Design an enzyme around this catalytic site. Structure first.
Site, PDB file in Angstrom:
ATOM      1  N   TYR A  42     -21.051   0.865  -7.220  1.00 28.08           N
ATOM      2  CA  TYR A  42     -19.877   0.090  -8.006  1.00 28.08           C
ATOM      3  C   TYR A  42     -18.745   0.778  -7.647  1.00 28.08           C
ATOM      4  O   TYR A  42     -17.740   0.957  -8.566  1.00 28.08           O
ATOM      5  CB  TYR A  42     -20.288   0.001  -9.519  1.00 28.08           C
ATOM      6  CG  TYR A  42     -19.511  -1.180 -10.154  1.00 28.08           C
ATOM      7  CD1 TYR A  42     -20.238  -2.432  -9.532  1.00 28.08           C
ATOM      8  CD2 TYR A  42     -18.919  -1.367 -11.289  1.00 28.08           C
ATOM      9  CE1 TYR A  42     -19.676  -3.436 -10.003  1.00 28.08           C
ATOM     10  CE2 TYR A  42     -18.326  -2.401 -11.474  1.00 28.08           C
ATOM     11  CZ  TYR A  42     -18.743  -3.520 -11.301  1.00 28.08           C
ATOM     12  OH  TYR A  42     -18.299  -4.949 -11.674  1.00 28.08           O
ATOM     13  N   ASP A  89      -9.661  -0.315 -11.865  1.00 26.19           N
ATOM     14  CA  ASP A  89     -11.020  -1.044 -11.698  1.00 26.19           C
ATOM     15  C   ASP A  89     -12.015  -0.533 -10.487  1.00 26.19           C
ATOM     16  O   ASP A  89     -12.329  -1.358  -9.672  1.00 26.19           O
ATOM     17  CB  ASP A  89     -10.313  -2.474 -11.241  1.00 26.19           C
ATOM     18  CG  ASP A  89     -11.643  -3.612 -10.985  1.00 26.19           C
ATOM     19  OD1 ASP A  89     -12.311  -3.805 -11.865  1.00 26.19           O
ATOM     20  OD2 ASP A  89     -11.345  -4.520  -9.958  1.00 26.19           O
ATOM     21  N   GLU A  98     -15.028 -22.033  -9.311  1.00 27.52           N
ATOM     22  CA  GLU A  98     -14.052 -21.182 -10.200  1.00 27.52           C
ATOM     23  C   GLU A  98     -15.191 -20.202 -11.039  1.00 27.52           C
ATOM     24  O   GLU A  98     -16.379 -20.469 -10.824  1.00 27.52           O
ATOM     25  CB  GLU A  98     -13.525 -21.961 -11.183  1.00 27.52           C
ATOM     26  CG  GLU A  98     -12.628 -22.995 -10.511  1.00 27.52           C
ATOM     27  CD  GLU A  98     -11.380 -22.053  -9.995  1.00 27.52           C
ATOM     28  OE1 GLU A  98     -10.599 -21.583 -10.650  1.00 27.52           O
ATOM     29  OE2 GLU A  98     -11.159 -22.286  -8.644  1.00 27.52           O
ATOM     30  N   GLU A 141     -19.446  -7.190  -6.495  1.00 29.70           N
ATOM     31  CA  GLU A 141     -19.025  -8.389  -7.395  1.00 29.70           C
ATOM     32  C   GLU A 141     -18.927  -9.531  -6.825  1.00 29.70           C
ATOM     33  O   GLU A 141     -19.237 -10.680  -7.478  1.00 29.70           O
ATOM     34  CB  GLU A 141     -17.748  -7.772  -7.810  1.00 29.70           C
ATOM     35  CG  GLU A 141     -17.374  -6.793  -8.967  1.00 29.70           C
ATOM     36  CD  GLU A 141     -17.941  -7.456 -10.119  1.00 29.70           C
ATOM     37  OE1 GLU A 141     -18.091  -8.528 -10.469  1.00 29.70           O
ATOM     38  OE2 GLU A 141     -18.963  -6.706 -10.751  1.00 29.70           O
ATOM     39  N   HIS A 181     -24.200 -14.465 -12.692  1.00 30.09           N
ATOM     40  CA  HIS A 181     -23.528 -13.340 -12.116  1.00 30.09           C
ATOM     41  C   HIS A 181     -23.953 -12.089 -12.503  1.00 30.09           C
ATOM     42  O   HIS A 181     -24.281 -11.310 -11.924  1.00 30.09           O
ATOM     43  CB  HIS A 181     -21.784 -13.572 -12.817  1.00 30.09           C
ATOM     44  CG  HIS A 181     -21.067 -12.321 -12.133  1.00 30.09           C
ATOM     45  ND1 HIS A 181     -20.020 -12.308 -11.324  1.00 30.09           N
ATOM     46  CD2 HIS A 181     -21.029 -11.025 -12.550  1.00 30.09           C
ATOM     47  CE1 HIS A 181     -19.578 -11.205 -11.284  1.00 30.09           C
ATOM     48  NE2 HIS A 181     -20.088 -10.421 -12.185  1.00 30.09           N
ATOM     49  N   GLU A 182     -24.147 -12.120 -14.020  1.00 29.80           N
ATOM     50  CA  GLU A 182     -24.474 -10.757 -14.610  1.00 29.80           C
ATOM     51  C   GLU A 182     -26.055 -10.403 -14.095  1.00 29.80           C
ATOM     52  O   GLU A 182     -26.357  -9.255 -13.611  1.00 29.80           O
ATOM     53  CB  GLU A 182     -24.408 -10.648 -16.089  1.00 29.80           C
ATOM     54  CG  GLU A 182     -23.016 -10.212 -16.426  1.00 29.80           C
ATOM     55  CD  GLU A 182     -21.999  -9.177 -15.478  1.00 29.80           C
ATOM     56  OE1 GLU A 182     -22.937  -8.097 -15.135  1.00 29.80           O
ATOM     57  OE2 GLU A 182     -21.018  -9.130 -15.339  1.00 29.80           O
ATOM     58  N   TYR A 190     -13.645 -19.180 -20.973  1.00 24.76           N
ATOM     59  CA  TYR A 190     -12.374 -18.690 -20.695  1.00 24.76           C
ATOM     60  C   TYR A 190     -11.279 -19.373 -21.526  1.00 24.76           C
ATOM     61  O   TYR A 190     -11.090 -20.705 -21.363  1.00 24.76           O
ATOM     62  CB  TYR A 190     -11.843 -18.253 -19.191  1.00 24.76           C
ATOM     63  CG  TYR A 190     -10.696 -17.439 -19.107  1.00 24.76           C
ATOM     64  CD1 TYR A 190     -10.643 -16.254 -19.620  1.00 24.76           C
ATOM     65  CD2 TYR A 190      -9.738 -17.988 -18.341  1.00 24.76           C
ATOM     66  CE1 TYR A 190      -9.721 -15.354 -19.323  1.00 24.76           C
ATOM     67  CE2 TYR A 190      -8.635 -17.138 -18.056  1.00 24.76           C
ATOM     68  CZ  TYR A 190      -8.811 -15.966 -18.562  1.00 24.76           C
ATOM     69  OH  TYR A 190      -7.495 -15.271 -18.499  1.00 24.76           O
ATOM     70  N   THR A 191     -10.421 -18.523 -22.242  1.00 24.97           N
ATOM     71  CA  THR A 191      -9.293 -19.384 -23.055  1.00 24.97           C
ATOM     72  C   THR A 191      -9.566 -20.738 -23.401  1.00 24.97           C
ATOM     73  O   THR A 191      -9.046 -21.692 -22.886  1.00 24.97           O
ATOM     74  CB  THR A 191      -8.007 -19.211 -22.071  1.00 24.97           C
ATOM     75  OG1 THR A 191      -8.275 -20.009 -20.990  1.00 24.97           O
ATOM     76  CG2 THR A 191      -7.587 -17.980 -21.816  1.00 24.97           C
ATOM     77  N   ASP A 251     -18.316 -25.849  -9.932  1.00 22.10           N
ATOM     78  CA  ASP A 251     -17.209 -25.849  -9.219  1.00 22.10           C
ATOM     79  C   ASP A 251     -17.176 -24.646  -8.292  1.00 22.10           C
ATOM     80  O   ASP A 251     -18.268 -23.767  -8.587  1.00 22.10           O
ATOM     81  CB  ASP A 251     -15.965 -26.021 -10.268  1.00 22.10           C
ATOM     82  CG  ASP A 251     -16.047 -25.161 -11.267  1.00 22.10           C
ATOM     83  OD1 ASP A 251     -16.580 -23.843 -11.375  1.00 22.10           O
ATOM     84  OD2 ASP A 251     -16.152 -25.587 -12.203  1.00 22.10           O
ATOM     85  N   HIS A 270     -26.543  -9.012 -10.743  1.00 24.17           N
ATOM     86  CA  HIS A 270     -26.315  -7.521 -10.537  1.00 24.17           C
ATOM     87  C   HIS A 270     -27.656  -6.791 -10.837  1.00 24.17           C
ATOM     88  O   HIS A 270     -28.028  -5.870 -10.086  1.00 24.17           O
ATOM     89  CB  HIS A 270     -25.381  -6.853 -11.487  1.00 24.17           C
ATOM     90  CG  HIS A 270     -23.845  -7.009 -11.597  1.00 24.17           C
ATOM     91  ND1 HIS A 270     -23.470  -6.842 -10.082  1.00 24.17           N
ATOM     92  CD2 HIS A 270     -22.979  -7.561 -12.192  1.00 24.17           C
ATOM     93  CE1 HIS A 270     -21.968  -7.078 -10.262  1.00 24.17           C
ATOM     94  NE2 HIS A 270     -21.851  -7.470 -11.487  1.00 24.17           N
ATOM     95  N   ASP A 308     -36.372 -16.413 -36.258  1.00 26.70           N
ATOM     96  CA  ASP A 308     -35.852 -17.680 -36.904  1.00 26.70           C
ATOM     97  C   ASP A 308     -36.984 -18.333 -37.758  1.00 26.70           C
ATOM     98  O   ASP A 308     -38.071 -18.395 -37.337  1.00 26.70           O
ATOM     99  CB  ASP A 308     -35.390 -18.754 -35.773  1.00 26.70           C
ATOM    100  CG  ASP A 308     -34.779 -19.703 -36.411  1.00 26.70           C
ATOM    101  OD1 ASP A 308     -33.655 -19.792 -36.596  1.00 26.70           O
ATOM    102  OD2 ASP A 308     -35.279 -20.987 -36.642  1.00 26.70           O
ATOM    103  N   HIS A 350     -13.148  -5.907  -8.910  1.00 26.03           N
ATOM    104  CA  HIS A 350     -12.874  -7.231  -9.168  1.00 26.03           C
ATOM    105  C   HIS A 350     -11.716  -7.724  -8.476  1.00 26.03           C
ATOM    106  O   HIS A 350     -11.624  -9.269  -8.508  1.00 26.03           O
ATOM    107  CB  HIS A 350     -12.672  -7.321 -10.780  1.00 26.03           C
ATOM    108  CG  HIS A 350     -13.991  -6.708 -11.445  1.00 26.03           C
ATOM    109  ND1 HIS A 350     -13.849  -5.724 -11.972  1.00 26.03           N
ATOM    110  CD2 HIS A 350     -15.154  -7.774 -11.987  1.00 26.03           C
ATOM    111  CE1 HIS A 350     -15.215  -5.637 -12.929  1.00 26.03           C
ATOM    112  NE2 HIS A 350     -15.784  -7.104 -12.654  1.00 26.03           N
TER     113      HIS A 350
HETATM  114 CA   LIG Z   1      -9.581 -22.483 -20.619  1.00 25.74          CA
HETATM  115 CA   LIG Z   2     -33.408 -22.190 -37.857  1.00 29.36          CA
HETATM  116 CA   LIG Z   3     -17.753 -21.879 -12.560  1.00 31.25          CA
HETATM  117 CA   LIG Z   4     -18.330 -25.500 -13.953  1.00 30.02          CA
HETATM  118 ZN   LIG Z   5     -19.949  -8.188 -11.933  1.00 34.21          ZN
END
Ligand SMILES: [Ca+2]
Ligand SMILES: [Ca+2]
Ligand SMILES: [Ca+2]
Ligand SMILES: [Ca+2]
Ligand SMILES: [Zn+2]
Length: 316
Positions: free
Chosen positions: A157, A226, A187, A166, A142-143, A193-194, A185, A146, A57, A231
């Site tokens: 896996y 899966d 979740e 997982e 999470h990743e 997500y969405t 939380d 692994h 950059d 999952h």
């Molecule tokens: Ca959402």
């Molecule tokens: Ca920049």
């Molecule tokens: Ca979360």
């Molecule tokens: Ca959160």
């Molecule tokens: Zn995973």
């Protein structure tokens, strides 16, 4: 790159401003020299070749919308590294300060992120199901978790060991999210997500059945999709870990919670000392009991709660 360590400023995927560790040598690069052998973030430029180019950059300010996913991938790999170092005394994912590399802008409209055995890779999402996946600290942790599992238990896996693999990644991603105190939380993936629906997420640890995942061993998925349900059947272990931490009554079985910190100590110990590549759920139960026994004594409340939780999800 060889250069001078400095600090730049940018905006992440959610619009939040943050400082990030960069390196200067003609350009400012996303290379953090303050953690282990370094954290390196690359631009895959919407292709699938990896890792792509080390992110460069011109002025050490990352406020362009194309910069966002790189800012958060870079920053949240630093927070995950700090969590493992400060809480569990583990230096990076191999325990010897291995460099952490991530590439963002992988492919086009790609709705996923993953640890490929050598580095992290993040899609930008299609803008409807997901926004750039590195904006979720629980997804990043999470990743990267692994990678920790690959260097320790080595859980294959597929089938029950893959489900454990997982669940371990969901548990530690959630603990990292609590450690950074980023609106925490139980979740997974709710920040990315969405973008058009409020309140939902990819999976839930506190109630896996809200999205149709099993929350009891009698509801496990036995087919072949899966990779044998890695999952899907991870919900059984996620619910058990939520109960151990938070307590509650589930299918008539009452569990006293012992909190997040002890949850993380028991599972980290089970992961680094007792699980093996082919461990199944029943072996996970024995490993977690033994870990809690090591740490707190065989007649502790902590051992009692680990048993009740696995009894509540039907894992003997
Ligand atoms: Ca959402
Ligand atoms: Ca920049
Ligand atoms: Ca979360
Ligand atoms: Ca959160
Ligand atoms: Zn995973």
């Amino acid at each position: 790159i060889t250069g001078t360590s400095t600090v730049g400023v940018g905006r992440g995927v959610l619009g939040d401003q943050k400082n990030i560790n960069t390196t200067y040598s003609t350009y400012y690069y996303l290379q953090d020299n303050t953690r282990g052998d370094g954290i390196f973030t690359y631009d895959a430029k919407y292709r699938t070749t990896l890792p792509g180019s080390l992110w460069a950059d011109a002025d050490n300010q990352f406020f362009a919308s194309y910069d966002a996913p790189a800012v958060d991938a870079h920053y949240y790999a630093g927070v995950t590294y700090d969590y493992y170092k400060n809480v569990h005394n583990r230096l990076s994912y191999d325990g010897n300060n291995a460099a952490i590399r991530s590439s963002v802008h992988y492919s086009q409209g790609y709705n996923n992120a993953f640890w490929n055995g050598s580095e992290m890779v993040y899609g930008d999402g299609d803008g409807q199901t997901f926004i750039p996946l590195s904006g979720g600290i629980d997804v990043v942790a999470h990743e990267l978790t692994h990678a920790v599992t690959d260097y320790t238990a080595g859980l294959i896996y597929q089938n029950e060991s893959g489900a454990i693999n997982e669940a371990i990644s969901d548990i530690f991603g959630t603990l990292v999210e609590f450690y950074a105190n980023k609106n925490p939380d139980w979740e997974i993936g709710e920040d990315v997500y969405t973008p058009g629906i409020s309140g939902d997420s990819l999976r839930s640890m506190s109630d896996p059945a809200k999205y149709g995942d099993p929350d009891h061993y009698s509801k496990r998925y036995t087919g072949t999709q899966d990779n044998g349900g890695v999952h899907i059947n991870s919900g059984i272990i996620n619910k058990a870990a939520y109960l151990i931490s938070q307590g509650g009554t589930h299918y008539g079985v009452s569990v006293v919670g012992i909190g997040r910190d002890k949850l993380g100590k028991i599972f980290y110990r089970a992961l680094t000392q007792y699980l093996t590549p082919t461990s199944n759920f029943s072996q996970l139960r024995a490993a977690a009991v033994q870990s809690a026994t090591d740490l707190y004594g065989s007649t502790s409340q902590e051992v009692a709660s680990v048993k009740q939780a696995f009894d509540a999800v039907g894992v003997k």
